Curated annotation (Swiss-Prot), chain B:
Gene Ontology annotations of biological process type: bacterial-type flagellum assembly; bacterial-type flagellum-dependent cell motility
Record localization: Bacterial flagellum basal body
Protein name according to UniProt: Flagellar hook-basal body complex protein FliE
Example of a GO MF term: structural molecule activity
InterPro entries linked: FliE
Keywords (A to Z) from UniProt: Bacterial flagellum
GO cellular component: bacterial-type flagellum basal body
Keyword Lipid biosynthesis: no
Recorded family membership: Belongs to the FliE family.
Pfam families reported in the protein's UniProt record: FliE
Curated annotation (Swiss-Prot), chain C:
Lineage, broadest ranks: Bacteria, Pseudomonadati, Pseudomonadota, Gammaproteobacteria, Enterobacterales
GO CC aspect terms: bacterial-type flagellum basal body, rod
PROSITE patterns the record matches: FLAGELLA_BB_ROD (PS00588)
Protein name according to UniProt: Flagellar basal body rod protein FlgB
Domain of life of the organism encoding this protein: Bacteria
Consequence of gene loss (knockout): Defects in flagellar assembly process.
InterPro entries the UniProt entry points to: Flag_bb_rod_N, Flagellar_basal_body_rod_CS, FlgB
Swiss-Prot record, chain G:
Name of the protein in its database record: Flagellar M-ring protein
Quaternary state and interactors: The basal body constitutes a major portion of the flagellar organelle and consists of four rings (L,P,S, and M) mounted on a central rod. The M ring is integral to the inner membrane of the cell and may be connected to the flagellar rod via the S ring. The S (supramembrane ring) lies just distal to the M ring. The L and P rings lie in the outer membrane and the periplasmic space, respectively.
Family: Belongs to the FliF family.
Localization (cell): Cell inner membrane; Bacterial flagellum basal body
Function: The M ring may be actively involved in energy transduction.
Ranges annotated as biased composition (Polar residues): 1-9
Induction or repression: Inhibited in nutrient-poor medium.
Residues of the full protein shown: 358 to 408 of 560
Taxonomy, superkingdom: Bacteria
Length: 164, 93, 125, 164, 164, 164, 51
């Protein structure tokens, strides 16, 4: 029931990422000379979070006060000195409440496999690509897939001649 | 909990915006006040019996007498209210 | 809170009389200790200052110690005669003040009791 | 259900960013001599926040007062000196409550992949572009995509001859 | 639903900024010899704010008073001096409450990309523009776009010959 | 909905400022020899403010009193002097409450771009204007646009020959 | 010397409520088998380490 809807959601996301990669990889490598497939680890767990933050007021310069009683006594007779300080302070503090409801269906970790073809010249020899072109393909695929390191995304692009 | 802080953020966000009397509520408030006064007097007397230093006998007796007066006032108000209700509900419509 | 306000003055005066009685009894007890200075409280000033005018820990939890949060200017009695042990307790004045304080404590009790008696007699029906 | 609506929202945003890039990249590079694709990491999490700020009043110059009692006593007999200062102060403080409801559907991180063609002269030789022109294309794409560093936007523009 | 309305609002704002830029850039550079595109980062977050300000009253010259009790005693017998000053002051303070509801749909950050053509004389040679003319175009575009530094606006105008 | 109404309001304000500038710039520069466009940053935020002001009464000359108790005692026996002054004063203070509801749709910052043509004499040579005439145009545009420095208004008028 | 100190604090608080999805993957094991390479002659040449 709901599981099938989630699976179809994942399939559509993967297909659209695949198409976005293919769109940029087509003009330079050529139609059919590139194949990519995407798998997506998604987030279907309902989470609700409330965050409370208090600004520190331990420093007297940023401390906000409402009432303060400072009783000071010094009975000098060091000799028979007698110092007494009774201090009472009531503070008002900064407060920030944030309520967050995470979206259901977010992407947790995306891994993408891309395979490119060789280059057959007018003679027909399948000449492999170069390192610079491979790096360009890797960068383009990283851009298309929305590659990020916090998610833990992995990308692998290899070059090999396609079969007949 | 999460419900409670959602409620408190709601409270602040209504406070920012700002910047039906019920007899049952009033009766509950009066009963709570009488109970609170009685409980405070009882607690102070219990602490004084246990030898607590910062409590004096005259204060204990005065607080007990004030609690007794408040409870007597509550009893009399209840009696008058019950008499009024029994008079009203005895009609022939 | 009108019952507290109506009975506040006499109850506070009675408490102050009890405190001053404790101080006078301490004066009488120390009548022979050398180097002791007789002390007392100005009743009127303290009473007006109390009528005109700690921080317990926040027990947000239901399982922690309630802990504790934890003021009369003691005026020295002017000595009548000098004594070699430096004891400024003149027993005649202290006894007169003791009798006066006990009498006024009893009067405060009588007045407060009359107020409570009248208030309870009004409600009796 | 709602996930499909969010996905269509993302697709429309990406398509419009793509079209905006293409619009400026067309007059100079030429029709078809430029291809770009956009992916958008969006924000579909409902957040509600209330912020309270108190202005500090620790300095006596900016402190606002309602009532102040200052009892000072000095019984000089340093000798048998006796100083006593009882100070009670009630303050009124500045207060600022801000209530914020973040919009659903905002952009978190935008990464854009752009590929340009070579230059075929009247002879037909695919002459590659120059460094200055590449820098101009990068700047134009950054302007079109709304490039920002707080979001964490990444842009990659590479030059390569298009396939037939 | 609402997201589409917000997107159309952004598109209309961007189109009108584009047209305003084109209107002034047309008479001097010429029809079609100028192309500009605008992207707008907008504000669709409902914010409500209440501000309270208290005027400081720490200086006795600007302090407003309602009641003041000053008991002064000096029992001179420095010798057996005895000074006692009991001061109680009740103040009335200036107060300013400001309630603000920010508009939904305001502009946060505007970045604009403008491209101009070369100058083909009667012979037909595409002569590039000059530095003074480029500075004039930059100033005119800044004026049209409402350029501001608090927002964080970025503008890029480059000169390049248009393609056929 | 409301955003479109606000945008149309801004467009009408900008158009009327443009027409007012053109009206004075026409008789001297000539019909069509002047083009101006206006952009307006407007204020669509509902603000409500209440201001309270207290006149200071710290000086005894401007202090208004209702009741005053001055107990003075001097028991001269400096010797065994004993001065005691108990002063209690109740004041009445001037009070001014101002309640302000700012208008919705006010102008925050206006920037205007004006371009003028060259002067083609009977021969046809496009003779540029002079510094004095440019200063006069700047002053006239400042007057027409309602130029102010508190708002942060910026004006740019440049001289360049119009294209065919 | 005598120092009596009483302090009341306000602390940051974060409540997170999570309902895990039913049907998530715990452990995935996959078995893949590939064929040999038969050239034009027909000899089943095995693949290489890099492939």
């Amino acid at each position: 029931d709901l599981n099938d809807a989630q699976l179809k959601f994942a399939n559509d996301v993967e297909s659209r990422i695949q198409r976005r990669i293919e769109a940029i990889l087509s003009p330079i490598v050529g139609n059919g000379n590139v194949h990519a497939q995407v798998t997506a680890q998604l987030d279907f767990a309902n989470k609700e979070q409330t965050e409370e933050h208090y600004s520190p007021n331990g420093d007297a310069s940023k401390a906000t006060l409402r009432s303060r009683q400072l009783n000071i006594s010094e009975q000098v007779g060091a000799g028979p000195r007698s110092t007494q300080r009774n201090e009472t302070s009531n503070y008002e503090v900064d407060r920030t409440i944030r309520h967050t409801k995470m979206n259901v269906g977010d992407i947790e970790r995306l891994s993408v496999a891309v395979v490119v073809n060789y280059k057959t010249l007018a003679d027909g020899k399948p000449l492999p690509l170069t390192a610079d072109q491979m790096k360009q393909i890797e960068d383009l695929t990283r851009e298309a897939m929305g590659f990020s390191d916090k998610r833990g995304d992995t990308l692998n692009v290899v070059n090999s001649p396609f079969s007949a | 909990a999460i419900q409670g802080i959602e409620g408190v953020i709601s409270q602040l966000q209504a406070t920012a915006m700002a910047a039906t009397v019920s007899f049952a509520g009033q009766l509950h408030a009066a009963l709570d006040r009488i109970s609170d006064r009685q409980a405070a007097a009882r607690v102070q007397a219990e602490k004084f019996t246990l030898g607590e230093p910062g409590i004096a006998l005259n204060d204990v007796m005065a607080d007990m007498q004030k609690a007794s007066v408040s409870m007597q006032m509550g009893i009399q108000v209840r009696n008058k209210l019950v008499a009024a209700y029994q008079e009203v509900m005895s009609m022939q419509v | 809170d009108r019952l507290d306000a109506a009975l506040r003055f006499q109850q506070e005066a009675l408490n102050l009389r009890a405190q001053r009685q404790e101080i006078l009894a301490a004066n009488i007890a120390n009548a022979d200790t050398p180097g002791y200075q007789a002390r007392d409280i100005d009743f009127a000033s303290e009473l007006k200052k109390v009528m005109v005018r700690g921080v317990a820990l926040t027990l947000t939890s239901s399982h922690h110690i309630p802990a504790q949060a934890v003021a009369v200017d003691l005026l020295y009695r002017v000595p009548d005669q000098p004594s070699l042990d430096g004891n400024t307790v003149d027993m005649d004045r202290e006894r007169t003040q003791f009798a006066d304080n006990s009498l006024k404590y009893q009067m405060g009790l009588t007045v407060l009791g009359s107020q409570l008696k009248g208030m309870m007699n009004v409600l009796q029906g």
